[PDB]
RNA sequence: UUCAUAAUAACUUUUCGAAUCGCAUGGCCUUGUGCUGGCGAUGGUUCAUUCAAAUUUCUGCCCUAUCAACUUUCGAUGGUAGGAUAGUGGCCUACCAUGGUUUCAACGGGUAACGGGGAAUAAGGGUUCGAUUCCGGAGAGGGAGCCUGAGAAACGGCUACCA
RNA sequence: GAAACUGCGAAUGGCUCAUUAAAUCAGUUAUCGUUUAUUUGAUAGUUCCUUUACUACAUGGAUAUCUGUGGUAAUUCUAGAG
């Protein structure tokens, strides 16, 4: 149906290319998934070469990830917080690649309580040396700390949730993190 | 149309079958396998047109079902298996083993090989790459992939293959002054030495290859298959031995040799 | 009209042609997947319990 | 090369890792019917290869200025991002820029045009023809839409509307 | 071994030339830009989740062909139970 033909597109100059052949399967491109965050659902699809290519549908949760530490968790999503293609996907709350989003952050705390155990927002004798050997490694970039206290970090998902099925993404850190915050204050 | 093609029409039949213009609308499509459509040789052509052990396709089919036929160790019951270049076809009834090697003309030849040497198959590369479990592996243009090769088996360099077991006996490096058999159209089935390797960025590696007679010629690397170092090629080659004579030279040898 | 009665366990089943209209009027306005009584269907059937499943226009 | 490949982090409506099958009945006694083992079949993972597949590079078409402008509201040209796709992409969407082609014939029209291999003619140069045994491409009354499937926008499949 | 499900095939061949004039097509590259059943080559001790009494020498109920019960003016239409 929704084909990807170079057949259509008039032409490089203008010459309205005549409809050579009825459009083919191998040219096709299916309906856009635009997956929400409202009760976890996935349908697969039989693509080229068989291939189960899972289409995410109202996907809740995805494993959003640190940089400094290098970790990700069974992390709940909250909402579509800013999408730099089209703002249409912000209000409808449709999740998409490179969309800025908010992360429940409780799993990012619970695991951080082990990793270092210094706590973010504001027992046993030999562990105290592993606790002491670790920690004071990463100080974290302020916005992430306040967002840790908010229970709502700023990720920027990088899976393709109509292709993949998985809604797995990436916690914003540093410059890009500093940038998308300015756009969030511009939009709000 | 609508996916891959199942027939192969006889005029389209690659010429080095030497398939007959008449006596069939179709040709046997060489099935999928280790060798490319036109570079292969399906067994029907081999057993019928070439050797004449069968008088028709029926008899070839049965010949494969009873089953003394063994292309590269394994048996085959496939009338149109791609028995390509280097493929050791052993018929245990008659003991008439054949390696598949190009006559100087270009068209493949019956070489009635030993017990004996027909036991390894020389094979090229292709890749060098690595796979999962970090295993380094080598691939032969002439079909197979062989695991765990010697690190300095490089690309466009031959490899002797144990064939029955399927491992590595030995390898010949590719470089200057090394006997090289040829598998490219016009220079196809000639033999020579190697002088240059024009490197060329993107547009195909060339190789300047003087024969015994020292008539120079050029090919591409992909159409070249290193049979050894000069003097000792690792395969027993047919009468002619990769020389490729002139037209008058062939006319001379024919009308000189008249022994009734 | 005809009926298509079938006993499960024994595996014995029969044609019952019914010309009398009152006998057939019990089944009217029911749906495939329900229980029926033996007495209202006829005089030959009494005490039985049918199960309406299946049919044809 | 952001490659092959290897690591640290996890997830996941946690894929795959044989509750499968035909011939053969061997080897040790801890003398149980014990533990053991041959020749095959299919299946199944990504890597290979083959058959291919989609794109795509360059260059190349018949007549017409009694077609000199055309494309850009309704993607035209480019960009950023996504969306989709097996995948590249104005293939689609948002926001932005104003490009793009043109007398070295754009655009338009015509074609009693499917393209090529070739054919006839036959000094050389050529002309005209190529529906037609091979190779591509299309189509299965039209135009759509899709199921299954590795591969179909199938039509000796289906859904519809027109005829 | 009829029948049937599963498998695979029916996207091949065949016909035709309506479209179609940078489109197709020819050679030429490219896919470091992709899918590829089949093909013949390759190959998975880690499923366990505290480790003093647990399905593994084998887990479950269905559905077809069948047994009949039928319809129809028609049809390679098939509804119910076992
Ligand atoms: Mg066809
Ligand atoms: Mg290259
Ligand atoms: Mg990589
Ligand atoms: Mg695969
Ligand atoms: Mg993109
Ligand atoms: Mg026409
Ligand atoms: Mg023409
Ligand atoms: Mg033609
Ligand atoms: Mg015509
Ligand atoms: Mg054709
Ligand atoms: Mg007609
Ligand atoms: Mg159709
Ligand atoms: Mg057809
Ligand atoms: Mg038809």
PDB file of N, CA, C and O (backbone and C1' of nucleotides) and ligand atoms in Angstrom, chain B residues 1-2 5, chain D residues 138-140, chain E residues 11-16, ligand 1:
ATOM      1  N   UNK B   1      11.502 -12.772 -12.861  1.00  0.00           N
ATOM      2  CA  UNK B   1      10.146 -12.327 -12.394  1.00  0.00           C
ATOM      3  C   UNK B   1       9.749 -13.029 -11.103  1.00  0.00           C
ATOM      4  O   UNK B   1      10.001 -14.221 -10.935  1.00  0.00           O
ATOM      5  N   UNK B   2       9.156 -12.273 -10.183  1.00  0.00           N
ATOM      6  CA  UNK B   2       8.541 -12.831  -8.984  1.00  0.00           C
ATOM      7  C   UNK B   2       9.436 -13.812  -8.199  1.00  0.00           C
ATOM      8  O   UNK B   2       8.921 -14.703  -7.522  1.00  0.00           O
ATOM      9  N   UNK B   5      14.885 -18.169 -10.801  1.00  0.00           N
ATOM     10  CA  UNK B   5      14.573 -18.876 -12.034  1.00  0.00           C
ATOM     11  C   UNK B   5      14.933 -20.339 -11.898  1.00  0.00           C
ATOM     12  O   UNK B   5      15.983 -20.673 -11.357  1.00  0.00           O
TER      13      UNK B   5
ATOM     14  P     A D 138       9.483  -5.755 -14.196  1.00  0.00           P
ATOM     15  O5'   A D 138       7.945  -5.343 -14.113  1.00  0.00           O
ATOM     16  C5'   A D 138       6.948  -5.942 -14.962  1.00  0.00           C
ATOM     17  C4'   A D 138       6.423  -4.943 -15.973  1.00  0.00           C
ATOM     18  C3'   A D 138       4.982  -5.203 -16.415  1.00  0.00           C
ATOM     19  O3'   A D 138       4.081  -4.337 -15.725  1.00  0.00           O
ATOM     20  C1'   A D 138       6.435  -5.402 -18.269  1.00  0.00           C
ATOM     21  P     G D 139       3.095  -4.934 -14.614  1.00  0.00           P
ATOM     22  O5'   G D 139       2.120  -5.858 -15.459  1.00  0.00           O
ATOM     23  C5'   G D 139       0.760  -5.469 -15.595  1.00  0.00           C
ATOM     24  C4'   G D 139       0.127  -6.193 -16.741  1.00  0.00           C
ATOM     25  C3'   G D 139      -0.531  -7.521 -16.410  1.00  0.00           C
ATOM     26  O3'   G D 139      -1.825  -7.388 -15.810  1.00  0.00           O
ATOM     27  C1'   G D 139       0.761  -7.759 -18.367  1.00  0.00           C
ATOM     28  P     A D 140      -2.072  -7.797 -14.273  1.00  0.00           P
ATOM     29  O5'   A D 140      -2.986  -9.093 -14.378  1.00  0.00           O
ATOM     30  C5'   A D 140      -4.298  -9.030 -14.968  1.00  0.00           C
ATOM     31  C4'   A D 140      -4.283  -9.767 -16.287  1.00  0.00           C
ATOM     32  C3'   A D 140      -4.878 -11.180 -16.278  1.00  0.00           C
ATOM     33  O3'   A D 140      -5.718 -11.422 -17.392  1.00  0.00           O
ATOM     34  C1'   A D 140      -2.675 -11.220 -17.131  1.00  0.00           C
TER      35        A D 140
ATOM     36  P     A E  11       2.514 -20.049  -9.468  1.00  0.00           P
ATOM     37  O5'   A E  11       3.742 -19.304 -10.149  1.00  0.00           O
ATOM     38  C5'   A E  11       5.053 -19.368  -9.568  1.00  0.00           C
ATOM     39  C4'   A E  11       5.656 -17.989  -9.534  1.00  0.00           C
ATOM     40  C3'   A E  11       7.181 -17.926  -9.576  1.00  0.00           C
ATOM     41  O3'   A E  11       7.657 -16.827 -10.359  1.00  0.00           O
ATOM     42  C1'   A E  11       6.411 -16.884  -7.623  1.00  0.00           C
ATOM     43  P     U E  12       7.932 -16.987 -11.946  1.00  0.00           P
ATOM     44  O5'   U E  12       8.420 -18.492 -12.095  1.00  0.00           O
ATOM     45  C5'   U E  12       9.721 -18.898 -11.645  1.00  0.00           C
ATOM     46  C4'   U E  12      10.055 -20.237 -12.240  1.00  0.00           C
ATOM     47  C3'   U E  12       9.831 -20.353 -13.736  1.00  0.00           C
ATOM     48  O3'   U E  12      10.881 -19.746 -14.482  1.00  0.00           O
ATOM     49  C1'   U E  12       8.981 -22.276 -12.660  1.00  0.00           C
ATOM     50  P     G E  13      10.546 -18.819 -15.743  1.00  0.00           P
ATOM     51  O5'   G E  13       9.890 -19.841 -16.778  1.00  0.00           O
ATOM     52  C5'   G E  13      10.696 -20.822 -17.459  1.00  0.00           C
ATOM     53  C4'   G E  13       9.855 -21.982 -17.936  1.00  0.00           C
ATOM     54  C3'   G E  13       8.951 -21.684 -19.113  1.00  0.00           C
ATOM     55  O3'   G E  13       9.661 -21.673 -20.347  1.00  0.00           O
ATOM     56  C1'   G E  13       7.699 -22.818 -17.464  1.00  0.00           C
ATOM     57  P     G E  14       9.478 -20.437 -21.354  1.00  0.00           P
ATOM     58  O5'   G E  14       7.925 -20.486 -21.717  1.00  0.00           O
ATOM     59  C5'   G E  14       7.444 -21.549 -22.560  1.00  0.00           C
ATOM     60  C4'   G E  14       5.937 -21.594 -22.621  1.00  0.00           C
ATOM     61  C3'   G E  14       5.251 -20.338 -23.119  1.00  0.00           C
ATOM     62  O3'   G E  14       5.237 -20.367 -24.538  1.00  0.00           O
ATOM     63  C1'   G E  14       4.184 -21.076 -21.161  1.00  0.00           C
ATOM     64  P     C E  15       6.028 -19.269 -25.371  1.00  0.00           P
ATOM     65  O5'   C E  15       4.895 -18.205 -25.701  1.00  0.00           O
ATOM     66  C5'   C E  15       3.690 -18.639 -26.338  1.00  0.00           C
ATOM     67  C4'   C E  15       2.493 -17.943 -25.739  1.00  0.00           C
ATOM     68  C3'   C E  15       2.406 -16.443 -25.948  1.00  0.00           C
ATOM     69  O3'   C E  15       1.914 -16.230 -27.255  1.00  0.00           O
ATOM     70  C1'   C E  15       1.856 -16.964 -23.719  1.00  0.00           C
ATOM     71  P     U E  16       2.882 -15.680 -28.396  1.00  0.00           P
ATOM     72  O5'   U E  16       2.613 -14.108 -28.316  1.00  0.00           O
ATOM     73  C5'   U E  16       1.264 -13.580 -28.356  1.00  0.00           C
ATOM     74  C4'   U E  16       1.014 -12.623 -27.215  1.00  0.00           C
ATOM     75  C3'   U E  16       1.630 -11.246 -27.371  1.00  0.00           C
ATOM     76  O3'   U E  16       0.820 -10.495 -28.262  1.00  0.00           O
ATOM     77  C1'   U E  16       1.762 -12.015 -25.117  1.00  0.00           C
TER      78        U E  16
HETATM   79 MG1  LIG F   1       7.572 -15.540 -16.490  1.00  0.00          MG
END
